[PDB]
C-alpha cells in the first residue's frame, strides 16, 4: 500500500510541476508596488486580566469578541470602545471564539473539549460536546450550523439547535489548528499539525484537495476575498499562497530575518495586503502580489495571539499576550 | 448615554474579578500514568494557611501535547511526579523533565519535583543506568534516591539559570505533608520573583 | 511534503530527509521494540553540537548528521523497528512529542534483528 501511495503522490506532483508554467512574482513585475503603510493605533481596548487568546469581528464592522486566559469572554463596541458584554467561562482554558453573522450568538471553546454557545438576545445556550480532543477554532455558518475544529485531528458540522455533529471531517493526521469558512459558505479550509491543509466540502462531507508545502506546523489559515485561494502561517517562519483552481502554491512571504512563528494570519479588503501577527510581538504587512513586506505594526508587549480585519476593511484588530486588544487604522 | 453606564457597572466587576483572580495560585500536575500522581481536566483545590491553590491534571487529549501546553504559560507551578520505582521509564521520565525544562514557553516556570513510591524503591533496592557505579553519595541528609535525584538536578542545572528553579522531594504514598512542601516552594517561587523584579532582572 | 526515508537492517543506519531545511532542525533517533512502546535512543542538534544518548546504548552508538548532504547516521556496534524523528519546530533544542504514538515529522522506520 505504500508503494501505490508513493506513486500517487509522485503523480500529484508531477502534475502539479506540469502545470506550473509561470510564477505569481513574475507576473505582478510590471505593477506599481504598494507604498510604505503606515497604521497608526486609534484605539486600545484593555480590561482583560491576563492573556488574550482571540478575537472575532462582528458582521457589523463595530461590535467584536475577544476570550482572555481568565476564562472571560468580553464583547466591546471598537468605536465608543465601551464594553458591551462581559461572560465568564466555566472553563478558563479557551482557545477560540466566534461571532455570529446575524450578531445575536457567539461561540467559543477550549480543552473542555466543548463548544459553548451563548445567545446575547447572557447565558449559556448550547453546550456541543462531541470531541475528544481540545477545540481550536470555530466558525459559525448561520444561527443554526456550526463548524468547529479539534485537537483529535478531526472536523465537525454541527446542527446547534439539535446539538449533534451533522457531519465530520477526517484525513488529518495531526491536531487541527484553524479553519476559514469560503465567502459562499459552501467550502472551508482547515490547517493542522501535519504540515498541511485541507478543502472540504461542507454539504458532501470530503476532502477536495490537499495542500503540502509548508515545513511545519500551521497555526493560522485565511480565505481570499473571491474565494479562489487562502492564506496560512506556520511555525517555520513563512506564510504561504495557495490557489485553490491551481491546487498549488503560488507565493511564499518570509525573510532571513524572521526565527519565530505566525500565530495568525489576515486578508485586506481587496486582497492585496496580508497582515500576519508573530511571536516576536509585531505584526508584519506584506504585499500579497509582490511578496514584499509593505509594512510593520509595533507596539505590543507581547506575541500577537489573534488578528482580524473588519468586514468592511476600514480598521486591523490585534490582541496579544499583554492583555490588550489593539485597533489599527 | 446608557451604553457608558453598562461599561462601568462591566469595570466594577471586571474589578472585583481581578482581586479573585489575583488572590489564587494555580499548579499544572504533570507525570506519567505509572506515577502516583492521583495520589499526590481534574480540578483540585485546597488551602494551605489560608492560601487558595488549584491545581489541573489534563489528561483528556492524545499524547502529541506541545500545543495544549502553551495554554499554561502563567502558570505558578509545575509540580512534576517521577515513580522513582520503575528503572524502566526512568528515562523516559528524565527525557520528559528536559522538555518540559527546556521549552520556550515554559521556561520562566519552576519545577516542584515529587519523586513518589520511595517505599518501593526501598523494597527494590534491598536485595539501566550505568554511571550509577562510579557515583557517590552527597554530603546531604539522610544513595540511589539521591543518584535519581542528581539525575534529575543535572539537566535542571544545565540551563536556564536565574530564571527558574526545581525544588526536589522524596515522597511515598501515604505521605501527608505534600501540600505543605507546595506552599513552601511557591513562597519560594514568588519571593525570586520579587528579587528579579527588583533587580529589574 | 516533509519526507523521511530510513534505510539500514554493527549497522550504519541512515536517514535520508526532504521537503525542510535539515540544518534548521535538531535529529532524534527512535526505536520501538516488539510488544513495548516507542523508546528514544540519541539525539544530536543542528550544528554538531552537544549530543544525548539513552542509558542502554550509552557509549555503544554514535549519531553524526550531514546538512550538507541532508541525512542523518546512527552507527551502532536490541531488536526494534527504528525511526528518525524531527524536532517540530526549527532554533529550537527541545524535540517535544517525537515518541508519540502517531508523529507527523517521523520516518517508516527500519527493522533491526540481533
Known amino acids: 500500500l505504500r508503494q501505490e501511495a508513493e506513486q500517487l503522490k509522485n503523480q500529484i506532483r508531477d502534475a502539479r510541476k506540469a502545470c506550473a508554467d509561470a510564477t505569481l512574482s513574475q507576473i505582478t513585475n510590471n505593477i506599481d508596488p504598494v507604498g510604505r503603510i503606515q497604521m497608526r493605533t486609534r484605539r486600545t481596548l484593555r480590561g482583560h486580566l491576563a492573556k488574550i487568546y482571540a478575537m472575532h469581528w462582528g458582521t457589523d464592522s463595530r461590535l467584536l469578541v475577544s476570550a482572555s486566559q481568565d476564562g472571560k469572554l468580553i464583547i466591546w463596541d471598537s468605536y465608543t470602545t465601551n464594553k458591551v458584554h462581559a461572560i465568564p467561562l466555566r472553563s478558563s482554558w479557551v482557545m477560540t471564539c466566534a461571532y455570529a453573522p446575524s450578531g445575536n450568538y457567539v461561540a467559543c471553546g477550549g480543552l473542555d473539549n466543548i463548544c459553548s454557545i451563548y445567545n446575547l438576545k447572557v447565558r449559556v445556550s448550547r453546550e456541543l460536546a462531541g470531541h475528544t480532543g481540545y477545540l481550536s477554532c470555530c466558525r459559525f455558518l448561520d444561527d443554526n450550523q456550526i463548524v468547529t475544529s479539534s485537537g483529535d485531528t478531526t472536523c465537525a458540522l454541527w446542527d446547534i439547535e439539535t446539538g449533534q455533529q451533522t457531519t465530520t471531517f477526517t484525513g488529518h493526521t495531526g491536531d487541527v489548528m484553524s479553519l476559514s469558512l469560503a465567502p459562499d459558505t459552501r467550502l472551508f479550509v482547515s490547517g493542522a499539525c501535519d504540515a498541511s491543509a485541507k478543502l472540504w466540502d461542507v454539504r458532501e462531507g470530503m476532502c477536495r484537495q490537499t495542500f503540502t508545502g509548508h515545513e511545519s506546523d500551521i497555526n493560522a489559515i485565511c480565505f481570499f476575498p473571491n474565494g479562489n485561494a487562502f492564506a496560512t502561517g506556520s511555525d517555520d517562519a513563512t506564510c504561504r499562497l495557495f490557489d485553490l483552481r491551481a491546487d498549488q502554491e503560488l507565493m511564499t512571504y518570509s525573510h532571513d530575518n524572521i526565527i519565530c512563528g505566525i500565530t495568525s494570519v489576515s486578508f485586506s479588503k481587496s486582497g492585496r495586503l496580508l497582515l500576519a501577527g508573530y511571536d516576536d510581538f509585531n505584526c508584519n504587512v506584506w504585499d500579497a502580489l509582490k511578496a514584499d513586506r509593505a509594512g510593520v505594526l509595533a507596539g505590543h508587549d507581547n506575541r500577537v495571539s489573534c488578528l482580524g480585519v473588519t468586514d468592511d476593511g476600514m480598521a486591523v484588530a490585534t490582541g496579544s499576550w499583554d492583555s490588550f486588544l489593539k485597533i489599527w487604522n | 448615554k446608557a451604553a457608558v453606564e453598562r461599561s462601568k457597572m462591566i469595570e466594577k466587576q471586571l474589578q472585583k474579578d481581578k482581586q479573585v483572580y489575583r488572590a489564587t495560585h494555580r499548579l499544572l500536575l504533570l507525570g506519567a500514568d505509572n506515577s502516583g500522581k492521583s495520589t499526590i481536566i481534574f480540578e483540585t483545590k485546597f488551602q494551605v494557611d489560608k492560601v487558595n491553590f488549584h491545581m489541573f491534571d489534563v489528561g483528556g487529549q492524545r499524547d502529541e501535547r506541545r500545543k495544549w501546553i502553551q495554554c499554561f504559560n502563567d502558570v505558578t507551578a509545575i509540580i512534576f511526579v517521577v515513580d522513582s520505582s520503575d528503572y524502566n521509564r526512568l528515562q523516559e521520565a528524565l527525557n520528559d523533565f528536559k522538555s518540559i525544562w527546556n521549552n520556550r514557553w515554559l521556561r520562566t516556570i519552576s519545577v516542584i519535583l515529587f519523586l513518589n513510591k520511595q517505599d518501593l524503591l526501598a523494597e527494590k533496592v534491598l536485595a539501566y543506568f550505568p554511571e550509577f557505579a562510579r557515583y557517590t553519595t552527597p554530603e546531604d541528609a539522610t544513595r540511589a534516591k539521591y543518584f535519581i535525584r542528581d539525575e534529575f538536578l543535572r539537566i535542571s542545572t544545565a540551563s536556564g539559570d536565574g530564571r527558574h528553579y526545581c525544588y526536589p522531594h522524596f515522597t511515598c504514598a501515604v505521605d501527608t505533608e505534600n501540600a505543605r512542601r507546595i506552599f513552601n516552594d511557591c513562597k519560594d517561587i514568588i519571593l525570586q520573583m520579587n528579587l528579579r523584579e527588583y533587580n529589574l532582572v | 511534503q516533509v519526507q523521511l526515508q530510513e534505510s539500514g537492517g554493527s549497522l550504519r543506519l541512515s536517514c535520508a530527509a526532504s521537503?525542510?531545511?535539515?540544518?534548521?532542525?535538531?535529529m532524534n533517533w527512535v526505536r520501538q521494540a516488539p510488544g513495548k512502546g516507542l523508546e528514544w535512543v540519541s539525539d544530536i542538534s543542528q550544528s554538531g553540537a552537544s549530543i544525548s544518548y539513552t542509558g542502554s546504548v550509552k557509549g555503544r552508538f554514535t549519531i553524526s548528521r550531514d546538512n550538507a548532504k541532508n541525512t542523518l547516521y546512527l552507527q551502532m556496534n536490541d531488536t526494534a523497528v527504528y525511526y528518525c524523528?524531527?524536532?517540530?519546530?526549527?532554533?529550537?533544542?527541545?524535540?517535544?512529542?517525537?515518541?508519540?504514538?502517531?508523529?507527523?515529522?517521523r520516518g517508516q522506520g527500519t527493522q533491526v534483528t540481533v
Open positions: 524523528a524531527r524536532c517540530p519546530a526549527p532554533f529550537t533544542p527541545f524535540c517535544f512529542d517525537v515518541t508519540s504514538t502517531t508523529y507527523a515529522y
Open positions: 521537503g525542510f531545511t535539515f540544518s534548521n532542525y535538531k
